[PDB]
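User: Fold this; tokens only.

Assistant: Input:
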Amino acid sequence: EAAQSVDQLIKARGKVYFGVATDQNRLTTGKNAAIIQADFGMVWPENSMQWDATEPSQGNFNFAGADYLVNWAQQNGKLIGGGCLVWHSQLPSWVSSITDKNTLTNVMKNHITTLMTRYKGKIRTWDVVGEAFNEDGSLRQTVFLNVIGEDYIPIAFQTARAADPNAKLYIMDYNLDSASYPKTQAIVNRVKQWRAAGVPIDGIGSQTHLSAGQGAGVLQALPLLASAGTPEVSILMLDVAGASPTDYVNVVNACLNVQSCVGITVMGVADPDSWRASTTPLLFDGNFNPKPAYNAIVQDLQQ
């Protein structure tokens, strides 16, 4: 990695990684691979480890895309993140149609154990449960909550811990960017209770899809998230409408201010590949050149 890469510079400040989400298609097009090799220390799969990619029909697993990402990361000395193991948004129809509690519990356990066992020892962080909370802090009414009940979250983490004790297990959600927002306060209290009951939640991953100007509020929200007492917290899938250096520097400084925040992962590399490309929210432009926000992060990390 470059000496002045954001990953090398955030390591020198005591953190673990500066990461990025990617997948096979990106790694063979443009300059994505060259930038990841030089500038980032951890890679995450955008879609290749989601449920509809890995188990499109029950017990008929497909790992071709995820294997590609894992192999590439190992050949290039990058840490690997994985997920999401339990998430309502990318579910095959055969899962969402299950109505029996014992059936769905076993299907969920098998999905978790099969993915984690395949990459046992190679994955630093697994997103086990994603987007479980409504905006008011109540639990989102997914098929898992409807059929298994709220015990599905404890069961998921206990199953994951048993499959690979080397991985850090995370719950993840979005709109945890304001200290006064109900979802931010609700998840802290719920995670405290689960850990008090012995559930092995190692971390909270904050998605951090920001509108312009919302970076300032992370300075207070991230300390709040860390007050839940998990071993780790992180910023995940970071992007910012407008990509103002002020917002990006604020998010980095929040990470630096929180001892338990281990790193930051951005949603992608180049603006045109973003889901909201018209807001140019990433750190590299269409020609794969660093944007002012990138140079501002580098400068903030140097001194």
